[PDB]
Design a protein around this ligand. Structure first.
Ligand SMILES: [Mg+2]
Ligand SMILES: [Mg+2]
Ligand SMILES: [Mg+2]
Ligand SMILES: [Mg+2]
Ligand SMILES: [Mg+2]
Ligand SMILES: [Mg+2]
Ligand SMILES: [Mg+2]
Ligand SMILES: [Mg+2]
Ligand SMILES: [Mg+2]
Ligand SMILES: [Mg+2]
Ligand SMILES: [Mg+2]
Ligand SMILES: [Mg+2]
Ligand SMILES: [Mg+2]
Ligand SMILES: [Mg+2]
Ligand SMILES: [Mg+2]
Ligand SMILES: [Mg+2]
Ligand SMILES: [Mg+2]
Ligand SMILES: [Mg+2]
Ligand SMILES: [Mg+2]
Ligand SMILES: [Mg+2]
Ligand SMILES: [Mg+2]
Ligand SMILES: [Mg+2]
Ligand SMILES: [Mg+2]
Ligand SMILES: [Mg+2]
Ligand SMILES: [Mg+2]
Ligand SMILES: [Mg+2]
Lengths: 82, 129, 123, 80, 205, 156
RNA sequence: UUAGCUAGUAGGUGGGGUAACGGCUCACCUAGGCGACGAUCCCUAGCUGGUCUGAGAGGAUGACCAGCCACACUGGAACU
RNA sequence: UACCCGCAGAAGAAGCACCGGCUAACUCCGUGCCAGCAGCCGCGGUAAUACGGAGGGUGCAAGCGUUAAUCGGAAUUACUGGGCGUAAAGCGCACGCAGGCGGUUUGUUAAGUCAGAUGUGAAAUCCCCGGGCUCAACCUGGGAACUGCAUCUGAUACUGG
């Protein structure tokens, strides 16, 4: 089914995750439909390490796409910052 | 056969200048008039004049500065064997802007500089330098 | 030269053949020495050029120059050619690598030692 | 507004089917010359109403046959 | 990955001083600066145009102590960057950290400034920097840290820097042993004997 | 103040009853660091006499070149007998990108930023003639303004 | 220094068939269809985003990464 | 684990090619058209800067050379950007179908052409401005670009109808 999930595109030992919309049978870093942001766990101070287009995310959820556990965590952290 | 009058016009100019001819005459046309209009406005010939009704003869009065010719180089670009059309971004700069490129546009025949200021390109007749 | 002529028959390029065809786009090929011998060079030179007839691995039978002074090359010897022709020899297009798999380095050579497979002479 | 094309009719011998030469006019990708290129399409016609040398206007539809996926709408320049 | 041999042999080949030694003793005393090194050093052959382009590039390399792959990458960056390519090449060489240490006089030579960098004696904006080729942005402070502040060779290098000409684009405070890279230097701020066009023509075959 | 460069020396011959008589030719070019450029071609039994005859003829027969600040004014072409030559104005400090004899003639011409290419035969005599013809017929915005009878601002 | 190729072939009617159009299949009818803008045949070959070079136009190429296709001892077939 | 602090002492850490011209860098001793070099021109026959060693020097540098392979230089398949009297190259001549091209004027069309808009041209890559790893390589944000195609709205000089 269609899902919303991370995609490991970083260097070794220094990850960086593109949060994308993908059919769940595809590979992780492979084919996707729409890139709706990113997350950096090694994000320094004075930079964004989380950016999510929540209107598109709510658009795909209105289409019935599922959300990963980490993406739903990052939506929580945005809805706690805001 | 006479496949191309515009290259005949340019060749009669080029050989007139090289022969130090005062004036050059030729069978007239609506386009040959519009080109001599451009060459008069930009300053390469003194004056043109078309006379006659059934078969009109266009006479060009050439221009000489310090003895030698004004028109250093004049060339045909688009030809019946190979047409040349350019967009407004890819219009050429002859001699870094010193020469001109006679361009036929939808709003009549103009130079490349006026074609850029008009924001529209067309068919490149000749490079005049 | 007419643009119509080029439309009908375009400008075709020149497929350049390789002067080392036995390598088959490889840098080196292992061979077996068939006959080790000498050859007199062209007329302006005069020497006894040390050159071996080699059955290669891919099946070809090519001749190959033996560089340097002195060689322990015999028949039924397993060498490694690398490509590169001797100008002053008819038909020799390849060089044996000195210091490879049967061939020894040049005795008592102290300059250009890697071009001849010679270890660093410790003082 | 629907997409349609025009062209000469090459042949009409097979029934309920004509062959149409659409002659497109493209620029050469290298030398800049404009070259006429001809495209043949098998066009379904009802009633066998077209002739050779006839100009026609066709649209694309669902595949009627193996080599036929085009249907005319009207005829211009009927005669020779 | 560094030249470790004799330095005046390089200055003799280039024909002029490269400031490869501290300048306490005069270089004409320490070496025959007018004679090329080697057995055949007295003879001056007619040096070719490729020769003068090589000697100019080897001059600038032997001044700053940069090897060829890195000097090539500086040429690629200076040609990529806008404006004069040779001037951007000199602005990057003057932006090197061991050069800024030399120009502030914390080390007597550029090599000694390099050794202070390599031996963790330099803080850039508070953080210790170990790399000689660290680019120093304008409006950057650069200081001797606390532990190597009590070195003898530091205030001896500041003595020789007081003997030397003051650069305009810096502002050093020798008591705290720190300074401030205010701006990148102009070509007019630098030396006038460097023909940077010979290097551009060399890497523009 | 006139900088002087010899481009190439060449030994020529002349066969007589006794045998071959050898001689030397010298191709030198002078210039003032500005548009005043001039070349010479001397020939003698000896090299310093040939360079001196070449510098002598090069100091006269100078030619004037309407330069810009340090570069050319428009992309110009020059031919002489084997050597079609293209040269082009370039950005500041890109150097003289030119081949052989053209580097020496543009260096004494006082140009500093060119993009050149010598097609055809690269014989230094004809290619330095082709560059002298290209720089000589390179024309300014003032000369084209007076020629067409307009202002420079009307020419842009 | 491959010029002719094609009888399910090209099209039509109807039946069957498929998730679906359709010679996809079958009977019947017509005699067509492709081709010098290169059919057919032969050799080679996975394609692209791209990569290398080159001032550019171009040339060569398709490793890694990503998209499509194909195969899974070889040749076949179907089931769920 | 990164990272940081301390200890001890210059210790434990430089090689490869080349030096006749192209091509940066020269002398000596063996050697004798032998041994050998070699990318091309070419060196070697008793004073070899060209062979082999040494001293010196030059270029690179934890690499340096050789070989294979691609583009370049090569405007040497030339669209950009070549030629054909004698250097390679005008069919022995002509008619002529297809094809290519086409005098001048007006009207009309809007196909080509030009302009604008929309959709698309996956991401990555390249480029620009930045950010992050002590710097860089690298990773990364945004943008530009993807020079294309389709549709629509217009323009009518030129070409075509
Ligand atoms: Mg955490
Ligand atoms: Mg390194
Ligand atoms: Mg730059
Ligand atoms: Mg004379
Ligand atoms: Mg030539
Ligand atoms: Mg049936
Ligand atoms: Mg049915
Ligand atoms: Mg295959
Ligand atoms: Mg090129
Ligand atoms: Mg199987
Ligand atoms: Mg030399
Ligand atoms: Mg001797
Ligand atoms: Mg040699
Ligand atoms: Mg080539
Ligand atoms: Mg080419
Ligand atoms: Mg030719
Ligand atoms: Mg003959
Ligand atoms: Mg002939
Ligand atoms: Mg004839
Ligand atoms: Mg007409
Ligand atoms: Mg019209
Ligand atoms: Mg249109
Ligand atoms: Mg448009
Ligand atoms: Mg993209
Ligand atoms: Mg940074
Ligand atoms: Mg019309």
């Amino acid at each position: 089914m269609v899902t919303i999930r991370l995609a490991r595109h970083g260097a070794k030992k220094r990850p960086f995750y593109q949060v994308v919309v993908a059919d769940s049978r595809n590979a992780r870093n492979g084919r996707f439909i729409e890139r709706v942001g990113f997350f950096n766990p090694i994000a320094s101070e004075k930079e964004e390490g989380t950016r999510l287009d929540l209107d598109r995310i709510a658009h795909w959820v209105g289409q019935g796409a599922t959300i990963s556990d980490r993406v739903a965590a990052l939506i929580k952290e945005v809805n706690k910052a805001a | 056969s006479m496949q191309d009058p515009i290259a005949d016009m340019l060749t009669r100019i080029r050989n007139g200048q090289a022969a130090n001819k005062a004036a050059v005459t030729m069978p007239s046309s609506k386009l040959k008039v519009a080109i001599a209009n451009v060459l008069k406005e930009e300053g390469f010939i003194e004056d043109f004049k078309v006379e006659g009704d059934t078969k009109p003869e266009l006479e060009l009065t050439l221009k000489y500065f310090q003895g030698k010719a004004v028109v250093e180089s004049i060339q045909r670009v688009s030809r019946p064997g190979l047409r040349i059309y350019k967009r407004k971004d890819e219009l050429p700069k002859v001699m870094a802007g010193l020469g001109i490129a006679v361009v036929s546009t939808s709003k009549g025949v103009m130079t490349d500089r006026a074609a850029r200021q008009a924001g529209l390109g067309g068919e490149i007749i000749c490079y005049v330098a | 030269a007419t643009v119509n002529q080029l439309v009908r028959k375009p400008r075709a390029r020149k497929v350049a053949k390789s002067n080392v065809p036995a390598l088959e786009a490889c840098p080196q090929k292992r061979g077996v020495c068939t006959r080790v011998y000498t050859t007199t060079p062209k007329k302006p030179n005069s020497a006894l050029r040390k050159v071996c007839r080699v059955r290669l691995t891919n099946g070809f039978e090519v001749t190959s120059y033996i560089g340097g002074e002195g060689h322990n090359l015999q028949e039924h010897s397993v060498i490694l050619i690398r490509g590169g022709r001797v100008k002053d020899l008819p038909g020799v297009r390849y060089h044996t690598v000195r210091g490879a798999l049967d061939c020894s380095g040049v005795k008592d050579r102290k300059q250009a030692r890697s071009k001849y497979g010679v270890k660093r002479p410790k003082a | 507004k629907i997409r349609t094309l025009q062209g000469r009719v090459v042949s009409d011998k097979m029934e309920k089917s004509i062959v149409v030469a659409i002659e497109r006019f493209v620029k050469h990708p290298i030398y800049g010359k404009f070259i006429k290129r001809t495209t043949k399409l098998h066009v379904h016609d009802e009633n066998n109403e077209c002739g050779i040398g006839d100009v026609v206007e066709i649209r694309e539809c669902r595949p009627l046959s193996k080599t036929k996926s085009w249907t005319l709408v009207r005829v211009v320049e009927k005669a020779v | 990955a560094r030249y470790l041999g004799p330095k005046l042999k390089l200055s003799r080949r280039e024909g002029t001083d490269l400031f490869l030694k501290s300048g306490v003793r005069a270089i004409d005393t320490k070496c025959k600066i007018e004679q090329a090194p080697g057995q055949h050093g007295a003879r001056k052959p007619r040096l070719s145009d490729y020769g003068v382009q090589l000697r100019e590039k080897q001059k600038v390399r032997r001044i700053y102590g940069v090897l060829e792959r890195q000097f090539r990458n500086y040429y690629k960056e200076a040609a990529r960057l806008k404006g004069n390519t040779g001037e951007n090449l000199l602005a990057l060489l003057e932006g090197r950290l061991d050069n800024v240490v030399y120009r502030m006089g914390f080390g007597a030579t550029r090599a000694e400034a390099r050794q202070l960098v390599s031996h963790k004696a330099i803080m850039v904006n508070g953080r210790v920097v170990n790399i000689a080729s660290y680019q120093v942005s304008p409006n950057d402070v650069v200081s001797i840290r606390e532990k190597a502040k009590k070195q003898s060779r530091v205030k001896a290098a500041l003595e020789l820097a007081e003997q030397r000409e003051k650069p305009t684009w810096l502002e050093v405070d020798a008591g705290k042993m720190e300074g401030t890279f205010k701006r990148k230097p102009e070509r007019s701020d630098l030396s006038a004997d460097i023909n940077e066009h010979l290097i551009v023509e060399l890497y523009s075959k | 103040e006139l900088q002087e460069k010899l481009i190439a020396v060449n030994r020529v011959s002349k066969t007589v009853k006794g045998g071959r008589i050898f001689s030397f030719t010298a191709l030198t070019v002078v210039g003032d660091g500005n548009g005043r450029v001039g070349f010479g071609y001397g020939k003698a039994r000896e090299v310093p006499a040939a360079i001196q005859k070449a510098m002598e003829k090069a100091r006269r027969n100078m030619i004037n070149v309407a330069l810009n600040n340090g570069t050319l004014q428009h992309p110009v072409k020059g031919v002489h007998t084997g050597s079609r030559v293209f040269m082009q104005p370039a950005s500041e400090g890109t150097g003289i990108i030119a081949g052989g004899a053209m580097r020496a003639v543009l260096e004494v011409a006082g140009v500093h930023n060119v993009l050149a290419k010598a097609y055809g035969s690269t014989n230094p005599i004809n290619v330095v003639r082709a560059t002298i013809d290209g720089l000589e017929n390179m024309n300014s915005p003032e000369m084209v303004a007076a020629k067409r009878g307009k202002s420079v601002e009307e020419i842009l």
